Every structure is written in C-alpha cells, then in structure tokens.
C-alpha cells in the first residue's frame, strides 16, 4: 500500500524544502537527503478534484513517466549507449495524506517571490494519493541563467551536450522528449574540462566550458523497448496546441503536424524541433558576460547561426550529432 508523507519527508528533510518549480502536473521542491541535495516532484493521482486546470492522472496513466525516468537515469551507467545528460532517479513512492503544512509554506513563499500559475495544494484530503519522485539535484535551469552564461562558447557546449544526450537516448530507447523548453535544461558547474558519452559503442568527448547539462521533466516523453511503447497520449488535448507568445507553443503544433497526431509512433524529428527552439533562445533571449567581439568568438556565433538555419533539415538528434558541421 501507499506510505505516509513522513516516509519520504521526515521533519528535517521537510523543514529544508524550498519550492523550485511547478507545472500543471504539480510541484517541485529542493531539499537535502543524507547531506545530499535532491529535487522532489509531487504529482497528485487517482482523485476526482481538478488540479491546476486538469483532472488527475490514474496510476496507470502516470506509469509511463515513471518508466521513462528510470530508463533515462540508467543511461549514466550503461556502456554502449551512455550519457549523464539526463537526471538520476533516486526513488519513487506512492504517498497518501494531505499536503504537509511545511510544503504549503514553501509553496506560499514561492508564490510571494515568483508568483504561481497553480492552485494552492491545500484542498487534498488525508486519503489523497500522490506519486513522489526523488531526483538528483541537476542545478539551475537555462531560463534562470539567461544572463549568466560566460560566452557563446558555453552556448555551443550546451547545444552539443543536449544533442549528444538526445542522440544516445534515440539510439538506445527511440526516445523523444517532446517538451524540452528552456525550463527543462539544467546546468551545474563541473571542474571536468571534457565530458564523455558513448553512442552505439563509439565514445567521444565534449568540451564542458565548466558546465554539465541535465535534461529533465519526462511528463510528455516517449520511448520504447523490445517493441513496447511508453508515452503520453495527448491526441485529444485541446489547450496544448493553442498557446501563443513564444515559439515554444509552435513546437507543440509542429510536433502534431510531424506525427499526424499519432503520439505512439517514433518521430525523432521532435527532438530536432526542440533543439531548434533552444538554439533560437540562445541567439535571441540570452546575454553573455563576454560578448562576441573577438574573431574566435565571432566564428562560433556564425556556426550557431548556421546551425539555426540548417538544422531543421536533419531527421533526428543522432543525425545532427553525427553529421552537422557545428560538432566537427
């Protein structure tokens, strides 16, 4: 059966919780477990109340995301297709109870300082079920780092890292992220100068520029193993395809166009579209501590602009990694 919140969040862990993120799905908190930073994602399930504009998923409907989180976490310890470019999954629990007052206080603090699009999660009864996923702490998201990156050399490293991670997941799992907006790209400092990945048994390296990227949030993602497909069926979703004011919202429509609204199929082109969306953000909505006013930095900008304008002619992240000139 389910465990109480206190199993996952004993008092000391609970008192160090700070809200760091949110979505229609629920809430993300940061805390410390055994002297180690973690991130906790809490999703309400199985109940009849509306949560953040939507009906709650059933256990069956949340299982895809659990499976996908597990598979992507394992890629860090694999050999033939290996990347640390996702996020570690430490545990998954099914929790029963009302929302802890200390989490509501952290929610309130986030609402006061950043503002929330979500309902205050104070209406859940003591029989409410939740899934609680505990993840490795992956750093700070790219959006919050819009004005903090050193140079376009960093931006290139980020793009390489993302492309390689997606390619390794494509090769191993026929993976599509399907929601890789710039809130879902985390950055963390590293003293490694070179990061390593392996794609179908060929190892290669990427200059880090002092950051390691983690891709997060598999709410909409898709993959398969041994012909069994795991995915979020959004074919009957209205609102996902009606957004505007950001190219992000076009991607959802271009994905639907690419896949003819058949979300079970494999269309790794969706990874290319998200990469294009991300390249666009780097070229337009970000600013660097060091400008591009040296010849060496200028050539990097030209290469990323060239990537922006040619990448949509590639069929997958694998195709980009193996064949685009940006990564030679």
Ligand X SMILES: Cn1cc(-c2cc[n+]3[nH]cc(-c4ccncc4)c3n2)cn1
Exactly one of 155, 158, 216, 230 binds ligand X (CB under 6 A); that residue is: 216
Rounded to whole angstroms, how far apart are CA atoms 219 and 4? 24
From the CB of 276, what's the least distance to ligand X, in Å? Answer: 22
Q: Rounded to the nearest 10 degrees, how much is the dihedral formed by the CA atoms of 209, 212, 213, 216? A: -160
CA distance 235 to 79: 35
Closest chain position to ligand X (CB)? 21
Q: With contact defined as beta carbons under 8 Å apart, do 307 and 324 qualify?
A: yes
Question: Residue 84 or residue 179: which is nearer to Na ion going by CB?
Answer: 84
The site partner of 141 among Na ion, ligand X, none (C-beta below 5 to 8 Å per kind) is ligand X
Contact partner, 169, from ligand X, Na ion, none, Cβ < 5-8 Å per class: none
Cβ burial of 158 (10 Å; 0-12, 13-18, 19+) is: buried
Task: Rule CB under 6 A: say whether 185 interacts with ligand X.
Answer: no
> Is there binding between residue 21 and ligand X (CB under 6 A)?
yes
Say whether 35 sits in a helix, a strand or coil.
coil
Q: Is residue 120 within 8 Å of residue 101, measured between CB atoms?
A: no
Question: Smallest gap, in angstroms, from Cβ of residue 165 to Na ion?
Answer: 8
Among the candidate windows 54-62, 74-82, 136-144, 313-321, which touches ligand X by CB under 6 A?
136-144
- Annotated catalytic residue within 49, 108, 127, 179: 179
Stretch 62-101: interaction string toward Na ion, x if CB under 5 A = ----------------------x-----------------
Helix pair angle (295-310, 152-173), 10° resolution: 40
Residue 181 near residue 130, CB atoms below 8 Å = no
Ligand-binding site membership of 88 (annotated): no
Rounded to the nearest 5 percent, the helix, strand and coil shares of the chain are 40, 25, 35
23 is known to lie in a ligand binding site = yes
182 contributes a contact to ligand X by CB under 6 A = no
Give the largest CA-CA distance in the chain. Answer: 63
179 is catalytic: yes
39 near ligand X, rule: CB under 6 A: yes
Q: Is 141 in the site for ligand X (CB under 6 A)?
A: yes
| Residue partners of 170: CB distance under 8 A and separation at least 6 | 268, 271, 316, 317, 318
Q: Rule CB under 5 A: which of 206-235 touch Na ion?
A: 214
How many whole angstroms separate alpha carbon 65 and alpha carbon 221? Answer: 7
- 135 interacts with ligand X by CB under 6 A: yes
- What residues form the annotated binding site for ATP? 20-28, 41, 136-141, 179-184, 217-219
Q: Which residues bind ligand X (CB under 6 A)?
A: 20-21, 28, 39, 41, 87, 135, 137-138, 140-141, 186, 216-217
Give catalytic residues, as residue numbers: 179
Q: Which residues bind Na ion (CB under 5 A)?
A: 84, 214
- What residues form the annotated binding site? 20-28, 41, 136-141, 179-184, 217-219
């Amino acid at each position: 059966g389910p465990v109480p919140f206190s199993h996952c969040l004993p008092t000391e862990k609970l008192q160090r919780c700070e809200k760091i993120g949110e979505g229609v799905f629920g809430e993300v908190f940061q805390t410390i477990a055994d002297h180690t930073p973690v991130a906790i994602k809490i999703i309400a399930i199985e109940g009849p109340d509306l949560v953040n504009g939507s009906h709650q998923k059933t256990f069956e409907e949340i299982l895809p995301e659990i499976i996908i989180s597990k598979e992507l976490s394992l890629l860090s310890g694999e050999v033939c297709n290996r990347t640390e470019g996702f996020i570690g999954l430490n545990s998954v629990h099914c929790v029963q109870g009302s929302y802890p007052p200390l989490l509501l206080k952290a929610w309130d603090h986030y609402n006061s300082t950043k503002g929330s699009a979500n309902d205050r999660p104070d209406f859940f009864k003591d029989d409410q079920l939740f899934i609680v996923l505990e993840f490795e702490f992956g750093g700070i998201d790219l959006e919050q780092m819009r004005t903090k990156l050193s140079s376009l050399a960093t931006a290139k490293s980020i793009l390489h890292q993302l492309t390689a991670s997606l390619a390794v997941a494509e090769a191993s799992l026929r993976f599509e992220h399907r929601d890789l907006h710039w809130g879902n790209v985390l950055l963390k400092k590293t003293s490694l100068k070179k990061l390593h990945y392996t794609l179908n048994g060929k190892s290669s390296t990427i200059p880090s520029c002092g950051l390691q990227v983690s891709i997060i949030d598999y709410t909409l993602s898709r993959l398969e193993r041994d012909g069994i497909v795991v995915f979020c069926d959004v074919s009957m979703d209205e609102d996902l395809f009606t957004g505007d004011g950001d190219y992000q919202f076009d991607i959802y429509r271009l994905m639907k166009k690419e896949n003819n609204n058949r979300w079970g199929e494999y269309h790794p082109y969706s990874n290319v579209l998200w990469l294009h969306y991300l390249t666009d953000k780097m070229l337009k909505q970000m600013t660097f501590k060091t400008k591009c006013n040296t010849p060496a930095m200028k050539q990097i900008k030209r290469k990323i602009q060239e990537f922006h304008r040619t990448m949509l002619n590639f069929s997958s992240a694998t195709d980009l990694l193996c064949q685009h000139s940006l990564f030679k």
